[PDB]
Amino acid sequence: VRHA
Amino acid sequence: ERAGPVTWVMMIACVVVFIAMQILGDQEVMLWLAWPFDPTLKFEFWRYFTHALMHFSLMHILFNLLWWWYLGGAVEKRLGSGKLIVITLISALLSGYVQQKFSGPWFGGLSGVVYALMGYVWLRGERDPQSGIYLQRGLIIFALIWIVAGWFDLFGMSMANGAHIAGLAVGLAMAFVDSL
């Protein structure tokens, strides 16, 4: 998962 | 003084979602709130925005909410609730769009919105001091360091780089528009  | 209603409700919403993520698990919450990940979900309109409400680590939520509280609160106080709402909806939507295009739908966080607010408050102060809103020097430095860290992946977490830059872009673009 990519973190904004 | 203290955080206005928009500032406050976003913080509350983020905390509620974060608690749900600990209780139910990140995956279960993503199923409900993530950017549409199947053509069946394309009409679930909330998904184009609610990715901004999910956080995956303590560091991530704390720093995003810190920046939101300060810059969001400032925008809301000086320029009104409506302005903060519009910045938020535009930055969430565009940052999400760019991120999914580059890396797919599994992302979340308020940082697209935060980067928009950084660019907005800085550029608005720069081009339109009259506005009353600006990003003071120390904070310019700390925003820059924060940006750089994401860009060169200095938090040992996988970063949503599209969300981050689209965010910043949106903020700068809206400041430019408002400063005319």
Residue numbers in the entry:
A (entry chain B): 2 to 5
B (entry chain A): 91 to 270
What does the published report state?
Rhomboid intramembrane proteases are evolutionarily conserved proteins with numerous important biological functions, including growth factor secretion, regulation of mitochondrial dynamics, and membrane protein quality control (Fleig et al., 2012). Rhomboids are serine proteases with a Ser-His catalytic dyad (Wang et al., 2006), and they recognize their transmembrane substrates in a two-tier process. It is assumed that first a portion of the transmembrane domain of the substrate docks into an intramembrane interaction site of rhomboid within the plane of the lipid bilayer, upon which a linear segment of the substrate (possibly generated by local unfolding of the top of the substrate's transmembrane helix) interacts with the water-exposed active site (reviewed in Strisovsky, 2016a, Strisovsky, 2013).
To gain insight into these preferences and their possible interactions, we have generated tetra- and pentapeptidyl chloromethylketones (CMK or cmk henceforth) harboring amino acids preferred in positions P5 to P1 by the Escherichia coli rhomboid GlpG (GlpG henceforth), using the sequence background of the Providencia TatA (Stevenson et al., 2007), represented by the parent compound Ac-IATA-cmk. To provide mechanistic explanation for the observed increase in inhibitory potency, we determined the structures of GlpG in complex with Ac-RVRHA-cmk and Ac-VRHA-cmk. The side chain of Arg in the P5 position of Ac-RVRHA-cmk could not be modeled due to poor electron density, and the two structures are otherwise virtually identical; superposition of all corresponding Cα atoms yields a root-mean-square deviation of 0.19 Å per atom (using the SSM method as implemented in CCP4MG v2.10.4; Krissinel and Henrick, 2004, Mitchell et al., 1990). Both inhibitors interact with the L3 and L5 loops via main-chain hydrogen bonds, and via hydrogen bonds involving the side chains of the strongly preferred Arg and His in the P3 and P2 position, respectively. The interactions of the residues in the P4, P3, and P2 positions with the enzyme are structurally independent, explaining why the effects of substitutions in these positions are additive. The overall binding mode of both compounds into the rhomboid active site is similar to the binding mode of peptide aldehyde Ac-VRMA-cho (Cho et al., 2016). Collectively, these data show that rhomboid subsite preferences are additive in the context of an active site targeted inhibitor and that sequence optimization in this region can significantly increase the inhibitory potency of the compounds.
